């Protein structure tokens, strides 16, 4: 996560997309329905 | 058209404006930003072809769909922007560098507007920064967002609308809950006060065996309309792909003019050269040896130096 | 750039859900207890007890990745090809050879 | 986000709605948490009985005076709890009168 | 920039001008050089034949909803050749109906 | 502060370095939808309060 | 006031020592201290991703 | 700062206010001190007699052309002295004449 090739696939249209971006869900806290989450920055962006 | 949870609004508080902002892509060399929104822009109330108006989910208890003139939309970031195109849930516009994208459907009083934090900074293409596309200079290849509404960048999978409960439908009197469906609007009054009690009524019906409104929910069935897979709606029983809408403003290659620098004055000396280069804006200079030892030198230069 | 797609959440009124395995890229699921959520009426579930709420998320390719994208390659032994112009006496010829 | 609906001219002391009960907060515990409106949300037209949690109309409601730059005439108003910290949200919308 | 004039209310397919000859572009090479509208310049009222360079009115020229951008009623367009890179410009002015 | 008496824009300006400040241990542009609560202080909008 | 909660750090253990992999889009405060005679107190504002 | 008031539509050469006299500046020393109008404050409607610091109508006063900047018709002018350095301001309020 946060490094190059954090998301990979054999083609742009391939459905067999494999990734490990270290995404974790958090318990919602405010009564309005919404799903919060946090995630490492795009390692592709870091390499760029 | 669905209302959705908006991070910040003109009262600086959680809002459910049907103009909630989604993903804000900005990979366009020209600096145009593709914005997905939660209100359909580019259709009439029926959802047929049109360009002067837009349709957004209503706030009224009926929570139907209303269509208003698109002239009210004024995308703005650090400053006023300029709309480049409109197509359903997507808007294309060019904006000055800013920290946040703000959509303002507001008109006169109607101060509806949402804001999402998106870093936007002026970008340049080529090895020299330019504040404006320059008149003279070599032309290089680039890619910008297309203004043709037809050209498709992808699709988003929309699904059937999940049950939206509205409090007004339920009404508790003297500890007796009466579902009050809108006229001509059969409401599914599914409730459970110690025992499951579903059913559908269209008249003020006291839910028997039920005394706490906390145990009853009343909602109608408008499943004919389709909604985007937006994480602000509770998914319905089935969440499989109902349809696909093309993503407009597809990115396409094109040519871009870039500036040319001032030719460097060359001073020749023994086994060495001095470059008296000169450039007002940041200009990149790269020198590599033509031998096995590359020894490439890279440095952005500003002003004049040797 | 991956696009972090979050499917629309599903809530069981006051029953209980369970997290199913999927195959989406970095597919992640979690279960939370009592929520009693709000949408626009103010009560989107009766029975504010064991209000199980499933959260689901995964990633896919952003729409603009069809152009801005990096291909990773492994290179092996490289062959050299040269184009030659040869002139002999008065007569000249061009050819390409490996 | 709670919702309430009202019309113009409603007298001072006109009942709007208990917010604690809507949110399922013990009305007796309201004092224990010093329950009150967030000081950057208040407006004079509405006021809250802190002990009961009952919101009432505190000055005569007027779409013309209150709701310049708000044609549906939402007042947005907000509330919080201290023991432990909690925060909640209310919209108050003023509708037209059919006795026109 | 090839300046052109068009009247309003023109029919679809109505001729405006041959950009190819006016710019001395090889009509035979247009396809060979990928002669095509600049994507970020395309505008809905206008359309271009990609084989001859003949300009033909694409939409019934609306001298109101165009002219909200200008009472000069300017339609603006750019065209380019890929190999070698060559960029060209066109401006189209919607004339008024003189025979009112 | 300016009074726009039609075209009579009488105005007064004074220097004061008004920065964007935040509270807590995290920079942000907007109060995030999800997060912890903490004790802060802000001016009361009620025109009848007393500082 | 609501305030954001940073990304949960990834802790890598090693003999008499830890490594925090941190990700924070905006400046986040990191404060560490020992539990002995000497506080050895350290403070640093971190941006981006680092270790 | 010297506040002054004046009628509109007065002719060229109409005397209004004597800055040097009102300021108390030695009328004879003005020239010795290089007395003159401050460059980035001169108005085309008024001119200054450098021999006596006497301000007069240079061009026809008119609310439609002078008060274009602000309906509040209070013209503004600045004057300065070089040896020693001194600076002064003059506000000429255009009256609504009782003959209107």
Short mmCIF file of C-alpha atoms in Angstrom, two decimals, chain D residues 39-43 82 85-86, chain F residues 37-39 42-46:
data_model
loop_
_atom_site.label_atom_id
_atom_site.label_comp_id
_atom_site.label_asym_id
_atom_site.label_seq_id
_atom_site.Cartn_x
_atom_site.Cartn_y
_atom_site.Cartn_z
CA UNK D 39 -23.94 28.86 19.96
CA UNK D 40 -23.21 29.37 16.24
CA UNK D 41 -26.59 27.95 15.14
CA UNK D 42 -29.09 29.80 17.33
CA UNK D 43 -31.72 32.21 16.03
CA UNK D 82 -21.55 16.76 26.97
CA UNK D 85 -20.01 14.33 23.97
CA UNK D 86 -22.79 13.98 21.41
CA UNK F 37 -15.52 15.35 19.17
CA UNK F 38 -13.41 17.78 21.22
CA UNK F 39 -13.96 20.87 23.34
CA UNK F 42 -16.68 29.88 19.18
CA UNK F 43 -18.58 33.16 19.28
CA UNK F 44 -22.26 32.92 20.16
CA UNK F 45 -24.51 34.13 17.35
CA UNK F 46 -27.19 35.30 19.79
#
